[PDB]
Amino acid sequence: ACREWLGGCSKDADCCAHLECRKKAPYHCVWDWTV
């Protein structure tokens, strides 16, 4: 599940890479340097 930015997510291992799962719903990948 290598979800890209705003592709959604379920893991906190930054889903795909250089990301993070938005700990506030809707849960989706955001850049570790953004949001």
Strand partners, 20: 30
- Cβ-Cβ contacts under 8 Å for 5 (sequence gap 6 or more): 19, 29, 30, 31
Q: What is the DSSP string of 1-35?
A: ----TTS--S-SS-SSSSEEE-SSSS--EEETT--
Q: Residue 2 has which token pair?
A: 């290598």
CB 19 within 8 A of CB 34: no
Separation of alpha carbons 14 and 8, rounded Å: 11
How far, in Å, CA of 32 to CA of 21, rounded? 9
Residue with tokens 């849960």: 27
Among candidates 25, 32, 34, which has minimal Cα distance to 8?
25
Give the technique used to solve this structure: NMR
Torsion, Cα 33 24 2 6, to 10 degrees, reads -70
- Give me the residue spans of the domains in the chain: 1-35
